[PDB]
Amino acid sequence: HIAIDRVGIKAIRHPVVVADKGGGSQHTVAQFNMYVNLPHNFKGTHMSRFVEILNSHEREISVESFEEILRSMVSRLESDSGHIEMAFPYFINKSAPVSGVKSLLDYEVTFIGEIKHGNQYSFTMKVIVPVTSLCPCSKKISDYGAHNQRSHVTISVRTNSFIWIEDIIRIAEEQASCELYGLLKRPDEKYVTERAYNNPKFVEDIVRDVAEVLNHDDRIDAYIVESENFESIHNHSAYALIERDK
Amino acid sequence: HIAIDRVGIKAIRHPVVVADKGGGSQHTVAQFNMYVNLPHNFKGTHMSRFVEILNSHEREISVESFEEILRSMVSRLESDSGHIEMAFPYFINKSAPVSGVKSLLDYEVTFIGEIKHGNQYSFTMKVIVPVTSLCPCSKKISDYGAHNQRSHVTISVRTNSFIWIEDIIRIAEEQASCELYGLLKRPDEKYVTERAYNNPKFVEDIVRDVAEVLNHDDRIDAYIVESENFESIHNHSAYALIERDK
Amino acid sequence: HIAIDRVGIKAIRHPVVVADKGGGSQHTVAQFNMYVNLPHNFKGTHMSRFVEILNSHEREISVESFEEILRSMVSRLESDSGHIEMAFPYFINKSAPVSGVKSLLDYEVTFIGEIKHGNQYSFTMKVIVPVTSLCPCSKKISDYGAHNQRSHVTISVRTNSFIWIEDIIRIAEEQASCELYGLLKRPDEKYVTERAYNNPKFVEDIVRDVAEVLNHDDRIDAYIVESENFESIHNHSAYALIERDK
Amino acid sequence: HIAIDRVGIKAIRHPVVVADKGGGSQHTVAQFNMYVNLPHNFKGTHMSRFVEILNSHEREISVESFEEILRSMVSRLESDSGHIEMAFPYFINKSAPVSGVKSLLDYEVTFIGEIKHGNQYSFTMKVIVPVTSLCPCSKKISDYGAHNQRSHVTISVRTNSFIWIEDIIRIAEEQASCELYGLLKRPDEKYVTERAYNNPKFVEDIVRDVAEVLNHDDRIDAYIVESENFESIHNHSAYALIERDK
Numbered sequence: 001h002i003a004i005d006r007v008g009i010k011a012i013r014h015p016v017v018v019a020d021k022g023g024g025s026q027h028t029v030a031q032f033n034m035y036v037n038l039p040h041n042f043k044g045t046h047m048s049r050f051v052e053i054l055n056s057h058e059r060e061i062s063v064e065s066f067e068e069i070l071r072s073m074v075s076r077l078e079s080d081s082g083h084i085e086m087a088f089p090y091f092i093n094k095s096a097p098v099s100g101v102k103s104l105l106d107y108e109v110t111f112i113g114e115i116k117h118g119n120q121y122s123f124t125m126k127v128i129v130p131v132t133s134l135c136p137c138s139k140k141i142s143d144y145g146a147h148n149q150r151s152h153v154t155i156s157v158r159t160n161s162f163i164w165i166e167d168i169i170r171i172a173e174e175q176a177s178c179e180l181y182g183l184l185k186r187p188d189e190k191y192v193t194e195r196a197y198n199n200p201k202f203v204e205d206i207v208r209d210v211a212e213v214l215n216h217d218d219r220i221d222a223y224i225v226e227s228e229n230f231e232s233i234h235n236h237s238a239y240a241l242i243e244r245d246k
Numbered sequence: 247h248i249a250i251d252r253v254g255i256k257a258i259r260h261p262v263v264v265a266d267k268g269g270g271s272q273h274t275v276a277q278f279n280m281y282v283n284l285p286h287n288f289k290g291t292h293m294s295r296f297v298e299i300l301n302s303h304e305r306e307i308s309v310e311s312f313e314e315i316l317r318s319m320v321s322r323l324e325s326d327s328g329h330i331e332m333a334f335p336y337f338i339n340k341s342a343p344v345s346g347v348k349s350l351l352d353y354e355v356t357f358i359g360e361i362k363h364g365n366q367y368s369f370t371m372k373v374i375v376p377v378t379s380l381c382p383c384s385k386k387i388s389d390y391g392a393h394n395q396r397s398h399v400t401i402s403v404r405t406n407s408f409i410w411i412e413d414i415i416r417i418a419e420e421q422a423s424c425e426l427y428g429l430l431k432r433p434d435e436k437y438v439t440e441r442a443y444n445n446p447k448f449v450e451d452i453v454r455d456v457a458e459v460l461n462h463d464d465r466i467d468a469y470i471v472e473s474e475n476f477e478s479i480h481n482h483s484a485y486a487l488i489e490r491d492k
Numbered sequence: 493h494i495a496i497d498r499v500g501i502k503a504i505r506h507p508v509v510v511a512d513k514g515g516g517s518q519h520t521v522a523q524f525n526m527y528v529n530l531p532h533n534f535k536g537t538h539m540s541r542f543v544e545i546l547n548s549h550e551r552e553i554s555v556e557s558f559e560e561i562l563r564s565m566v567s568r569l570e571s572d573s574g575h576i577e578m579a580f581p582y583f584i585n586k587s588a589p590v591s592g593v594k595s596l597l598d599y600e601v602t603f604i605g606e607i608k609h610g611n612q613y614s615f616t617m618k619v620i621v622p623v624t625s626l627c628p629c630s631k632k633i634s635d636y637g638a639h640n641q642r643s644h645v646t647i648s649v650r651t652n653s654f655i656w657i658e659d660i661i662r663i664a665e666e667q668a669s670c671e672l673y674g675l676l677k678r679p680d681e682k683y684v685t686e687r688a689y690n691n692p693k694f695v696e697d698i699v700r701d702v703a704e705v706l707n708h709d710d711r712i713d714a715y716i717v718e719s720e721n722f723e724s725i726h727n728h729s730a731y732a733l734i735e736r737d738k
Numbered sequence: 739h740i741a742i743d744r745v746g747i748k749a750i751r752h753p754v755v756v757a758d759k760g761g762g763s764q765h766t767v768a769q770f771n772m773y774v775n776l777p778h779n780f781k782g783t784h785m786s787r788f789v790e791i792l793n794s795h796e797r798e799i800s801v802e803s804f805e806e807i808l809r810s811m812v813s814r815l816e817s818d819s820g821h822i823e824m825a826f827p828y829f830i831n832k833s834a835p836v837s838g839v840k841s842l843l844d845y846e847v848t849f850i851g852e853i854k855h856g857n858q859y860s861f862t863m864k865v866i867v868p869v870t871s872l873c874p875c876s877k878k879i880s881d882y883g884a885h886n887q888r889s890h891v892t893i894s895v896r897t898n899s900f901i902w903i904e905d906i907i908r909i910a911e912e913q914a915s916c917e918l919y920g921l922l923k924r925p926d927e928k929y930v931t932e933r934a935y936n937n938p939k940f941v942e943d944i945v946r947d948v949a950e951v952l953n954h955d956d957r958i959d960a961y962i963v964e965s966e967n968f969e970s971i972h973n974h975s976a977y978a979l980i981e982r983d984k
Contacts, residue, residue: 002454005488010474012482013827013844015766027765028753029827035485044448045383047484051921055841059831089751089767093797103793105727106751130727134637137291141682145626145689146637150724180727183789190633192725197637202290208248228256230722232642233684235597235622235672236258238293239281242251259581259598261520273519274507275581297675301595305585335505335521339551349547351973352505376973380883387928391872391884391935396970426973429543436879438971443883476968478888479930481843481868481918494946497980502966504974527977536940537875539976629783694782700740720748728750730785731773734743 004042008035008083009050016088017060018109021166027060030088036079049076061086066113067121074115084113090127090165094181096188097195103183105130109165112156126156127168131176132192133229136200148177148196149232153206157214158222175209177201203227204240211242221246250288254281254329255296262334263306264355267412273306276334282325295322307332312359313367320361330359336373336411340427342434343441349429351376355411358402372402373414377422378438379475382446394423394442395478399452403460404468421455423447449473450486457488467492496534500527500575501542508580509552510601513658519552522580528571541568553578558605559613566607576605582619582657586673588680589687595675597622601657604648618648619660623668624684625721628692640669640688641724645698649706650714667701669693695719696732703734713738742780746773746821747788754826755798756847759904765798768826774817787814799824804851805859812853822851828865828903832919834926835933841921843868847903850894864894865906869914870930871967874938886915886934887970891944895952896960913947915939941965942978949980959984 009032016030034050053072057065066084074082087110093102112124131151138146153172157163173179178196181188201209206227214223228239255278262276280296299318303311312330320328333356339348358370377397384392399418403409419425424442427434447455452473460469474485501524508522526542545564549557558576566574579602585594604616623643630638645664649655665671670688673680693701698719706715720731747770754768772788791810795803804822812820825848831840850862869889876884891910895901911917916934919926939947944965952961966977 002457002488004450004454004486007450007484007486009482009484013829014842015764015829026753028767042450044381044450047449048480048921051480051482051841055921091751091753103789104752132639132725135290138681138685139637141678142685142689144636145631145640145685147624147685147688148637148639148724149641150722150727178725180725182726182728183786183793184725186633189630189725193630193634193637193639196639197634203293204250204253204288204290208250211248230642232640232724233624233670233672233676233681234294234297234674235642236255236297236674238253238255240250240253242248259583260596261518261583272507275520294675297595301675337505337507349543350506378885378971384927384931385883387924388931388935390882391877391886391931393870393886393931393934394883394970395887396968396973424971426971428972428974429540429547430971432879435876435971439876439880439883439885442885443880476888478886478970479870479916479918479922479927480920481888482920494949494980496942496946496978499942499976499978501974501976534942536873536942539941540972543972543974627782695785696742696745696780696782700742703740726786726789728747728789730745730747732742732745734740 003038006035006037007039007042007047008033009047012054014054015060016086017062018088018090021164026091028088028090030061030086033085034073035083036073036077037081038079040078042077046077063111066111066123070113070115070121080118081116086111092166092169096181096183096185098187098191099185101183101185101188103181105180105182107169122158124156124158125163125165125168126154127165127172128152128154129169129172130180131173131178132180132196133177133203133206134196134200135202139197139200146197146200147232149229151176151206151227151229153210154224154226155210156224157220159219160221161219163219171210171213175206175213203229203238207240207242211244215244249284252281252283253285253288253293254279255293258300260300261306262332263308264334264336267410272337274334274336276307276332279331280319281329282319282323283327284325286324288323292323309357312357312369316359316361316367326364327362332357338412338415342427342429342431344433344437345431347429347431347434349427351426351428353415368404370402370404371409371411371414372400373411373418374398374400375415375418376426377419377424378426378442379423379449379452380442380446381448385443385446392443392446393478395475397422397452397473397475399456400470400472401456402470403466405465406467407465409465417456417459421452421459449475449484453486453488457490461490495530498527498529499531499534499539500525501539504546506546507552508578509554510580510582513656518583520580520582522553522578525577526565527575528565528569529573530571532570534569538569555603558603558615562605562607562613572610573608578603584658584661588673588675588677590679590683591677593675593677593680595673597672597674599661614650616648616650617655617657617660618646619657619664620644620646621661621664622672623665623670624672624688625669625695625698626688626692627694631689631692638689638692639724641721643668643698643719643721645702646716646718647702648716649712651711652713653711655711663702663705667698667705695721695730699732699734703736707736741776744773744775745777745780745785746771747785750792752792753798754824755800756826756828759902764829766826766828768799768824771823772811773821774811774815775819776817778816780815784815801849804849804861808851808853808859818856819854824849830904830907834919834921834923836925836929837923839921839923839926841919843918843920845907860896862894862896863901863903863906864892865903865910866890866892867907867910868918869911869916870918870934871915871941871944872934872938873940877935877938884935884938885970887967889914889944889965889967891948892962892964893948894962895958897957898959899957901957909948909951913944913951941967941976945978945980949982953982
């Protein structure tokens with residue numbers, strides 16, 4: 001009598017493989033969310049078809065698979081629009097800015113697949129990159145020392161060509177007050193604390209500076225940029241957000 | 247140079263007051279999310295104005311306050327569209343279906359305020375009501391015993407008149423395989439287990455039956471209905487969803 | 493054949509009432525955890541007796557009730573040692589240090605009841621108080637600006653007399669680099685940023701300074717003190733901990 | 739003046755490698771918790787030594803490494819007792835009980851290292867295995883259909899020889915009402931629903947039956963067994979627990 005707008009499954013772990021920019025690949029584990037819009041004659045028993053599709057490929061699911069996975073999905077469930085989601089930790093081995101001392105840093109990356117009007121596919125990637133931010137307010141009023149916090153710059157990007165996930169990470173890291181390292185030597189901490197003090201940005205200043213970089217990248221069709229402070233002196237969170245379609 | 251689409255704060259507790267249908271009111275605590283779209287000449291220092299507005303009213307914030315709060319918000323931050331959110335636990339003292347033995351049940355209720363084009367206000371309420379659901383699949387194939395699970399029927403409703411939060415709860419509870427009670431006597435458990443067995447519904451069947459009730463309520467302009475199983479025999483979650491505007 | 497060491501229920505919301513130091517009381521909502529050690533002839537059906545006991549008192553449970561609740565618990569379940577737990581948000585209306593501008597601050601308080609060897613009761617309270625902390629490392633090496641973060645000073649205290657929860661909060665807040673306020677005016681932020689810069693403490697320095705205050709309070713029989721940084725420049729958490737019995 | 743009882747870091751992701759029983763190894767990602775008891779002359783700057791130790795080994799940390807890691811830890815921080823923790827998802831490709839249809843199932847495994855009195859090492863592993871449980875209460879009173887739920891059997895084991903993590907998983911899975919599969923065909927669901935109905939166990943019955951198996955394994959020095967229901971008809975959680983040292 002009434003059409004179901006969407007059916008799907010969520011909260012389902014499964015091993016995945018992701019390629020490094022520095023030639024190679026990471027073997028990690030992703031949380032999944034799959035669904036299909038306006039399924040026809042959907043019998044409630046067919047819910048386990050999602051799990052089928054997810055297991056029918058490899059032991060470790062590649063991003064390459066997103067093509068057939070979505071194709072199988074929409075056909076096996078008689079809809080013409082589908083959606084997949086793959087959220088996983090991703091590691092970069094960063095070099096301390098002065099010492100060169102390497103240490104791993106983790107980012108929450110999520111790849112999002114989409115298929116509409118029968119066969120029209122579209123890829124989107126999202127990164128939650130952790131940065132340190134000093135706000136220029138404290139810098140101005142207080143004579144010595146300015147308060148800083150941990151921040152999360154989230155960038156989601158509707159892509160039209162290939163982009164390394166590392167590139168989008170860098171855009172955020174470059175644009176922040178300062179980037180996080182994980183292991184800091186004595187000379188390193190001297191650097192980053194002064195580097196951040198000499199480069200203070202408000203929550204809106206970061207999102208603005210990122211948006212501006214993303215406006216000009218021709219591989220990006222649409223984007224959402226959000227940064228949020230986990231306030232060092234307030235116990236709440238402030239956020240700013242920009243979103244544009246091209 | 248580039249317009250900020252939105253700025254706001256989130257993750258901020260504050261005591262609240264909510265009226266019972268059975269004359270009275272609950273004194274509880276809500277998590278908040280406030281923001282404003284397209285603020286003009288927004289100085290990063292003005293972020294603490296949200297906290298001001300939140301504290302400038304009562305010790306316990308009432309739903310009544312949503313009017314001035316949003317009005318203050320959009321003016322104090324020079325935007326013409328704002329948004330508030332108030333998520334809290336809500337309690338009903340339910341009577342065991344056979345025994346009449348009373349016990350409390352908690353629901354995650356969230357009130358959402360909106361103000362657009364200068365002064366046009368709009369209210370939305372959302373409830374995550376816990377139900378038990380037996381799926382008619384097991385009922386059919388297995389000779390004895392059918393597997394059931396805990397489910398979450400989420401109903402969000404763009405309202406155009408007053409609705410008791412209890413009413414929307416009931417719509418969900420009536421439409422489920424069976425409702426949750428919290429305290430069951432021997433005769434009660436005999437009832438509810440058989441009641442659910444004789445009333446099995448798939449995840450799509452529940453959302454369909456709820457949507458149908460909501461289509462005809464003239465106090466409801468738009469709605470989202472979602473139910474999801476925390477699968478007893480699968481370790482993942484299946485969900486179905488319906489959404490309509492009138 | 494084999495004795496069950498403990499049975500209990502957890503994850504159960506219920507409205508509660510807590511008295512303010514500044515005469516009055518807060519009406520909020522607590523998460524519960526109840527259990528009993530070495531129950532005799534425990535039939536699995538008796539699990540719903542916990543819910544009974546929890547509902548058999550008031551609509552809003554008081555700390556006073558902990559006496560009979562535990563007494564009922566151990567008797568109704570034939571054990572001689574029981575345990576209750578009551579975790580809730582708690583609010584203090586703080587005055588900005590220079591302006592006097594009042595704003596609410598929330599703390600995660602948890603009251604813990606214990607009854608052993610038949611009838612020997614014992615009370616314990618725990619507070620997770622949010623503070624800002626500057627570590628004297630950055631202060632030393634970098635010429636200008638020192639990095640700070642949000643910290644959680646957790647104090648749990650086996651009490652032998654009455655203590656206001658506010659007092660234990662203060663002990664933590666006084667001993668921190670600086671305390672959190674929620675709403676800061678221009679003169680206020682000037683103060684707190686300099687106040688913290690002139691009072692830097694490592695994670696171990698805070699726990700040490702708190703422990704020392706608690707050693708001499710004769711109302712405290714045993715304590716656990718823990719502080720942890722949500723590292724502004726590292727993406728992990730460091731913690732220090734002290735624990736003593738008297 | 740006052741001795742710090744422990745210092746450490748927590749909440750830190752890092753890639754790991756774990757061997758399969760069916761010859762091989764899983765490449766996944768673990769959350770870490772490291773600490774050292776009673777460190778001498780601990781300077782607050784030395785906190786980043788934990789991160790050093792964690793990065794100084796491989797890109798993917800093996801369980802083998804736990805020896806030197808703990809040895810480095812206690813020496814580099816001048817204490818004689820240390821502790822490491824490694825929590826990660828672990829996958830088994832299970833065969834549907836009737837069909838043989840393979841699908842992955844994830845378990846939350848955590849390896850725990852300990853080093854005391856200078857050099858005395860000790861290994862502990864913990865598994866949170868998801869099972870379905872029917873309680874014999876509903877089976878008895880209601881004429882048709884008995885209510886079941888998802889359950890978590892947690893087994894932590896102080897080991898004195900090598901044990902496959904898969905073995906401990908099986909102990910739990912065998913002892914449950916029925917085990918979870920992830921993908922069920924029509925004949926499979928017919929089986930498992932009847933299999934669980936003909937094998938009902940209370941929360942205490944499961945922990946008792948597991949404890950009994952673990953009492954007789956000579957590779958196990960001490961254990962904690964806990965199962966908890968996510969109540970299908972109650973909205974809270976019941977749990978039972980057993981713990982013994984040998």
